[PDB]
Amino acid sequence: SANIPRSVWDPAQHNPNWSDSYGHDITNRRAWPARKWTVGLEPCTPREWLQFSHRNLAYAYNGALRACHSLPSMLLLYKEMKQRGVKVDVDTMNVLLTRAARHEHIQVDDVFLLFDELVALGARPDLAAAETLHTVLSHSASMPEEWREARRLQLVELYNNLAMEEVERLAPHRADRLLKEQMKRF
Amino acid sequence: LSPLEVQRDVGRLEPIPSYAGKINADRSVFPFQWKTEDWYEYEVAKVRNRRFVFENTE
C-alpha cells in the first residue's frame, strides 16, 4: 500500500471523536473538592475509602441532627442526607419526629407523611417512634374523622408488629420478667 | 428464618436478598469435594497442555 496511511493525512478520513492532546491530561489531574456535602468528606485515597460507608454516615448525620434545636434547620440536613444516598436510622426517625411534633405550627398530616417516608427509606420503627406518633394522634382533634381512624388503624398495626418482633427478640434468652414488662407497656 | 432473612440491623429494615432461601443444596454442586487421583491427573494435564492451541481457527 502506501508507506504513510491515508487515515493520517486525508481530511475525508478525519476522526471526529479524537480530541487534542492538552485537554484530556488537563482534565485528568483535576481533584474536585472533597467537601461536596455538609457532614463528611468524600474519599480520595484507598486509605480514606476504608473509613467510609453510607451506613456510618448515618451516625454522623444523626449527630449533626441532634445538634439543630429547630425543625426548620433540621429539614435541610435531612434533605441532603436523603439525596446523597445515606442509610437512615431508627435514630434519624426519633430525632426528626420528636422535633416535628414539638414544633408548634406543624400540620399533623405532615408529621405522619414524614414518618411514612422515613419508613419507605427503610428505617425500622420502634417503641419511641410509635409512641411519639401516638402522642401526635392524641393532640389532633381538628382533622377529619376518617383521617383519625386511618392513622389509628396504622398505629395499632404498628404496635402489634412491634410486640411480636419484641417477643421474638426476648424469648430465646429466657427473659420472662422483662418480656412481661414490655408486653405490659404494649 | 434462614440466616440471610434475619434482620440484623437494629436501626434499619433491609430488603431480603433474592438468593436468601432459594439456592438449594447438592453436594454435586458445592462445596467442592473431590478424589485425589482425578485432581492429580487434572493438574498435570493442565500443565502439559499449555502449548496445544490452534491459534488460527475458522
Binding site: 448515618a58 451516625y59 444523626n62 436510622d89 435514630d91 | 437494629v10 436501626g11
Partner: peptide, 14 residues
C-alpha cells in the same frame, strides 16, 4: 439509648 450505641458499643472491648 441511641440505636447507634446499641449497634456499635454493645460488644466486649478494652
Amino acid at each position: 439509648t441511641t440505636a447507634e450505641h446499641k449497634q456499635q458499643d454493645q460488644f466486649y472491648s478494652p
